[PDB]
C-alpha cells in the first residue's frame, strides 16, 4: 500500500518471501556451476534459516529484524496470538452501522428507551432513510437521496422519526464483562451529541457519567430486530443472569430519596393526625401542612391475591408516615403494605422489586421501577440533602482509643526487644491490635453519629436515628459503606502495599483532620496498590474469564 510519497509500505511477509527467493536463486545458481561443497552447504543452511524465519520467525532463535530492528511478522505470528486472525478478525470484528459517544443521564426516559442524538441517528440509518425516500418518491435515484440526506433537509428528519419508531438499537459499554453489558433500547431522537442512558440500567453497565462512552449498534434484519426486542430489551433484563437478585435496582439518588421519604421523627408538622388515604397525605405534604416524615394514621387499602388469582381488597388504619403513604401510591395492587412501612434502604428496595416481580410479573415490575425512579428523584430533590464539613463529627472516644492502642504497641515492642517474641509475630500482634483499635473507633463513631440527634418540643427528650447527611447516605446504602465514612470521620487505619503487604504503621488522622506529610506518605502506598491492581492485575481476571468461556 503506498505510503506518503513514492515509498511503499514496508510489508513484513513480502520481505520474508523476498529473502527466501534470494537464497533459493543463489543456491540454484551455485548448484548449476557445481560450486565447492562448503559454499553450497552454507547456502543451504542460510536457505533453511530463511524458510524457518518465513514460517515462524524467532522460533529457532535470532529473530531476524528488518529496518527499525523490529522482528518481522511471519505467517505463524499472523495466525496466532492476540493480534492474529482468530482473536482479532474472526472471534471479534469491526462492524458497520455502529457509532460511539459519551453518555449522559436523561432521567425522563423509560426503561425501554434511550436517547440517541439526531446526528448519529441520521448517520447510522442512512440506508433506511434512502429506502423511505425512494418509497415516498422524494428522490428517484440514490444519488438524489444521498444529496438530500447530506444537506439535512427539513423533510429527511421526518423520515428519520418515522423509521426510528420501532427499531431497537444495541447499547454496549466497553468492558462487556457479562451479558448485561449490551442491551437493546428504543431510540428517542435527542438534540445533542451524547447518548442519554436510563439511570436504572447503569448498575448493569457499571456506567457512571464521569466521561464514560458507549457504542450504538443497529440491528438490520427482521430477525435481528425481533431478537433485540424480545431477548435484549432492558425491560426484559430485570434479573441478573448470575443470581436471582434484580439488576435494575435504583442505585444512589433514588434510594436516598426513598429513604428520606419513608422515615419518621418523634415530632414534625402534622403529627398524630388521621388521614383518609395516601391522596390526602400527598395533598397535605404539597400544601405544606405536614412534613414528609411525620407519624400519622392512614386508611390504606391493600390487595392480597391469596385467592385463585383474584385480588382481594383489605382496608385498615395503618400507623405510618406521610412519606410512606405518598410512596404507597406508586406500589402496584398485589403487594402488601408492610413492604413500604420500613426505612426503605437500598436492600429493602431491591427486595421490594424482587417480590413485585415474583408475585405480579414483568410489566408491573417495569412500571414499578420507572415510578420508583421518578418519585425517588423528585423527593431527593425536594429533601435538599446536602453534605457539609460539620456533618463529619469526630468521636470524643477516638483519642483515648488511639492512646490505648499506642500503649499496647509500646508494650509489645518492649517485649520484643527482650526477645520474648520474634519479628513476625510482633508484626502480627501489632497489626491485630491496630485493627481492633480501628474497629473500636469506627463503632464509637457510628454510635455517636446515628443517635446524634435528640429532638423534643412536646415533653421529655427522645432519641431518634439521626438526620445527619453522611449517616443518612451511609445507612440508606446510596453511596459508601462503613469503611469510607470511617476514613472520613474515624481513624482510617492500616494500609497495604501493592504486593499485599500491610504497613504496620497506621494512620492516626481522618480526612476531616489534617493527614500531615508523614501520614500522607503512608497513604500513597495504599493508593499505588489500588491503582496498580486496577491496571496491572486486571489481566488475571480477564485471562481467567477467557479460559472459563473457552472451556465452557
Partner 1 sequence: VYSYTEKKRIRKDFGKRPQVLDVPYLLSIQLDSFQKFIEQDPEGQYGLEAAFRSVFPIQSYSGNSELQYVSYRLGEPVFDVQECQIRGVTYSAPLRVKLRLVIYEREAPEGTVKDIKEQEVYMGEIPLMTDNGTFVINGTERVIVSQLHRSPGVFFDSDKGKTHSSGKVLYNARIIPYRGSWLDFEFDPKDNLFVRIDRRRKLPATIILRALNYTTEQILDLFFEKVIFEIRDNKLQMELVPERLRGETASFDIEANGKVYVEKGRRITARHIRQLEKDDVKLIEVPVEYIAGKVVAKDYIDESTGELICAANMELSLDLLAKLSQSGHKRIETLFTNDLDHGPYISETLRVDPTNDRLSALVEIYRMMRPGEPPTREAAESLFENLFFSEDRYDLSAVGRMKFNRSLLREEIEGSGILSKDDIIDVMKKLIDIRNGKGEVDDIDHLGNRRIRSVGEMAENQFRVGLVRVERAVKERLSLGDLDTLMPQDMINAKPISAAVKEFFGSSQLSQFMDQNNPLSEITHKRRISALGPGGLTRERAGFEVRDVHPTHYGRVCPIETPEGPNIGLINSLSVYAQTNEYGFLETPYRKVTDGVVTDEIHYLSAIEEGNYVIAQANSNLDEEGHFVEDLVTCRSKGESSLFSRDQVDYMDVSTQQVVSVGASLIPFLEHDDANRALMGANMQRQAVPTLRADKPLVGTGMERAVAVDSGVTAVAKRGGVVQYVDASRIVIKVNEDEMYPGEAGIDIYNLTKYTRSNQNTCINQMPCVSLGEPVERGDVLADGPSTDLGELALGQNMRVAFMPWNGYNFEDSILVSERVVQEDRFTTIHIQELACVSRDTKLGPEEITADIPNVGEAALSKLDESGIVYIGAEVTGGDILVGKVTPKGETQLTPEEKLLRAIFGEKASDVKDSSLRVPNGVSGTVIDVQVFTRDGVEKDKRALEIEEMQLKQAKKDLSEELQILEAGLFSRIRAVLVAGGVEAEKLDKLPRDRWLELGLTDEEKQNQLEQLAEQYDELKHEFEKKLEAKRRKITQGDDLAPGVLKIVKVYLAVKRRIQPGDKMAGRHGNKGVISKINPIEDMPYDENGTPVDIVLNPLGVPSRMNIGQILETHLGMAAKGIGDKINAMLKQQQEVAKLREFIQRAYDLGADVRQKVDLSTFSDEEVMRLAENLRKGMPIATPVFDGAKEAEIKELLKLGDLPTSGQIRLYDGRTGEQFERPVTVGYMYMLKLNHLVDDKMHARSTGSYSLVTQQPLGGKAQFGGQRFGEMEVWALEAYGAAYTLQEMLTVKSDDVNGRTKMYKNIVDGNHQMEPGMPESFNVLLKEIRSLGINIELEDE
Partner DNA sequence: GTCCGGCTTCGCCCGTAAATTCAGA
Partner DNA sequence: TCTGAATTTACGGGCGCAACTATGCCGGAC
Q: Quick one: which H or E segment has residue 58? A: none
* 206 touches, from Mg ion, DNA, RNA, none (C-beta below 5 to 8 Å by class): RNA
Interacting span for DNA (CB under 7 A) from 81-89, 181-189, 353-361, 386-394:
81-89
| Interatomic CA distance for residues 344 and 256, integer angstroms | 9
Q: Residue 172 or 523: which CB sits closer to DNA?
A: 172
DSSP letter for 340, please.
G
Using CA atoms, how far apart are residues 411 and 409, in angstroms rounded to an integer?
Answer: 5
Cβ neighbour number for residue 334 with a 10 Å cutoff:
19
Min separation Cβ 174 and RNA, Å: 3
Interface characters, 210-239, with Mg ion (x: CB under 5 A): x-x---------------------------
Beta bridge partners of 446: none
Q: Which residues pair with residue 239 across a beta bridge?
A: 246
- The residue among 198 and 318 lying less far from partner 1, judged by its C-beta, is 198
Q: Which does 100 bind (CB under 5 to 8 A by kind): RNA, DNA, Mg ion, none?
A: DNA
Strand, coil or helix: 264: coil
Binding mask 52-91 for RNA (x = CB under 7 A): ----------------x-x------------x--------
Helix axes 154-164, 126-136, angle to 10 degrees: 110
Question: Is 214 or 449 the residue whose CB approaches Mg ion more closely?
Answer: 214
Q: How far is CA 458 from the centre of its chain?
A: 47
Q: Is 538 in the site for DNA (CB under 7 A)?
A: yes
Smaller CB separation from RNA, 70 or 314: 70
Question: What is the distance between the alpha carbons of residues 264 and 296, in angstroms, rounded to a whole number?
Answer: 10
44 binds DNA (CB under 7 A): no
The torsion angles phi and psi of 182, rounded to 5 degrees, stand at: -140, 115
Identity of the residue, 124 or 300, whose beta carbon is nearer to partner 1 in the bound complex: 124
Nearer to RNA by Cβ, of 106 and 270: the residue is 106
Distance between CA atoms of residues 445 and 367, nearest Å: 40
Contact with RNA (CB under 7 A): which of 5, 534, 548, 549? 534
Residue 96 binding RNA, by CB under 7 A: no
The least distance separating Mg ion from the CB of residue 253, rounded to whole angstroms, comes to 16
Told to check if 457 binds DNA by CB under 7 A, we report: no
Alpha-carbon gap, residue 548 to 537, rounded angstroms: 17
Q: What is the footprint of RNA within residues 196-215 (CB under 7 A)? A: 206, 208, 210-213
Contact flag: residue 1 with RNA (CB under 7 A): yes
Shortest Cβ 257–partner 1 spacing (Å): 7
- Stretches 60-68, 190-198, 410-418, 473-481: which one binds DNA (CB under 7 A)? 60-68
Place of cell 403487594: 335
Indicate the residue among 88 and 140 with the shorter CB distance to DNA. 88
SS in 3 state form for 216-260? Answer: EECCCCHHHHHHHHHCCECCCCCECCCCCCECCCCCCHHHHHHHH
Rounded CA separation 25/259 (Å): 83
Q: All 3 cell numbers of residue 340? A: 413500604
Angle between helices 482-489 and 423-450 (to 10 degrees): 90
Query: Interface residues for RNA in 4-43 (CB under 7 A)?
Result: 9-10
Q: Is 210 annotated as a binding-site member?
A: yes
Maximum pairwise Cα distance, the chain: 120
Residues of this chain that interact with RNA (CB under 7 A) are: 1-3, 9-10, 68, 70, 83, 174-175, 206, 208, 210-213, 534-535, 538
Residues of this chain that interact with Mg ion (CB under 5 A) are: 208, 210, 212
Q: Residues comprising the binding site? A: 208, 210, 212
Q: Residues comprising the binding site for Mg(2+)? A: 208, 210, 212
Amino acid at each position: 500500500v503506498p505510503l506518503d510519497g513514492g515509498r511503499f509500505a514496508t510489508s513484513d511477509l513480502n520481505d520474508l518471501y523476498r529473502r527466501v527467493i534470494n537464497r533459493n536463486n543463489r543456491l540454484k545458481r551455485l548448484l548449476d556451476l557445481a560450486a565447492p561443497d562448503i559454499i553450497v552447504r552454507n547456502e543451504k543452511r542460510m536457505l533453511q534459516e530463511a524458510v524457518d524465519a518465513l514460517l515462524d520467525n524467532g522460533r529457532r532463535g535470532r529473530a531476524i529484524t528488518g529496518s527499525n530492528k523490529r522482528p518481522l511478522k511471519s505467517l505463524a505470528d499472523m495466525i496466532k496470538g492476540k493480534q492474529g486472525r482468530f482473536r482479532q478478525n474472526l472471534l471479534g470484528k469491526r462492524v458497520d452501522y455502529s457509532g460511539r459517544s459519551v453518555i449522559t443521564v436523561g432521567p425522563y426516559l423509560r426503561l425501554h428507551q434511550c436517547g440517541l442524538p439526531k446526528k448519529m441517528a441520521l448517520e447510522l440509518f442512512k440506508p433506511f432513510i434512502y429506502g423511505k425516500l425512494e418509497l415516498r418518491g422524494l428522490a428517484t435515484t440514490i444519488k438524489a437521496a444521498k444529496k438530500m440526506v447530506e444537506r439535512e433537509e427539513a423533510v429527511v428528519w421526518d423520515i428519520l422519526d418515522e423509521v426510528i419508531r420501532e427499531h431497537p438499537v444495541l447499547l454496549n459499554r466497553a468492558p462487556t464483562l457479562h451479558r448485561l453489558g449490551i442491551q437493546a433500547f428504543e431510540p428517542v431522537l435527542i438534540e445533542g451529541k451524547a447518548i442519554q442512558l436510563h439511570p436504572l440500567v447503569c448498575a448493569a453497565y457499571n456506567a457512571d457519567f464521569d466521561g464514560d462512552q458507549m457504542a450504538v449498534h443497529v440491528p438490520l434484519t427482521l430477525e435481528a430486530q425481533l431478537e433485540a426486542r424480545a431477548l435484549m430489551m432492558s425491560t426484559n433484563n430485570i434479573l441478573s443472569p448470575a443470581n436471582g437478585e434484580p439488576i435494575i435496582v435504583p442505585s444512589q439518588d433514588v434510594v436516598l430519596g426513598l429513604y428520606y421519604m419513608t422515615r419518621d421523627c418523634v415530632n414534625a408538622k402534622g403529627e398524630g393526625m388521621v388521614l383518609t388515604g395516601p391522596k390526602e397525605a400527598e395533598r397535605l405534604y404539597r400544601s405544606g401542612l405536614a412534613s414528609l416524615h411525620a407519624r400519622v394514621k392512614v386508611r390504606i387499602t391493600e390487595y392480597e391475591k391469596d385467592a385463585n388469582g383474584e385480588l382481594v381488597a383489605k382496608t385498615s388504619l395503618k400507623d405510618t408516615t406521610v412519606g410512606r403513604a405518598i410512596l404507597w401510591m406508586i406500589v402496584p395492587k398485589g403487594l402488601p403494605y408492610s413492604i413500604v412501612n420500613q426505612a426503605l434502604g437500598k436492600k429493602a428496595i431491591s427486595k421490594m422489586l424482587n417480590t413485585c416481580y415474583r408475585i405480579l410479573g414483568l410489566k408491573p415490575t417495569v412500571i414499578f421501577a420507572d415510578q420508583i425512579m421518578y418519585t425517588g428523584f423528585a423527593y431527593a430533590a425536594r429533601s435538599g440533602a446536602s453534605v457539609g464539613i460539620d456533618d463529619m463529627v469526630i468521636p470524643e472516644k477516638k483519642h483515648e482509643i488511639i492512646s490505648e492502642a499506642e500503649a499496647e504497641v509500646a508494650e509489645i515492642q518492649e517485649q520484643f526487644q527482650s526477645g520474648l517474641v520474634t519479628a513476625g509475630e510482633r508484626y502480627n500482634k501489632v497489626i491485630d491490635i491496630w485493627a481492633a483499635a480501628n474497629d473500636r473507633v469506627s463503632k464509637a463513631m457510628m454510635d455517636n453519629l446515628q443517635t446524634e440527634t435528640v429532638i423534643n418540643r412536646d415533653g421529655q427528650e427522645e432519641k431518634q436515628v439521626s438526620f445527619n447527611s453522611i449517616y443518612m447516605m451511609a445507612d440508606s446504602g446510596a453511596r459508601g459503606s462503613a469503611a469510607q465514612i470511617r476514613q472520613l470521620a474515624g481513624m482510617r487505619g492500616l494500609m497495604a502495599k501493592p504486593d499485599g503487604s500491610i504497613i504496620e504503621t497506621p494512620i492516626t488522622a481522618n480526612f476531616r483532620e489534617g493527614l500531615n506529610v508523614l501520614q500522607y506518605f503512608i497513604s500513597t502506598h495504599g493508593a499505588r496498590k489500588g491503582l496498580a491492581d486496577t491496571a496491572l492485575k486486571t489481566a488475571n481476571s480477564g485471562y481467567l474469564t477467557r479460559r472459563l468461556v473457552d472451556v465452557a
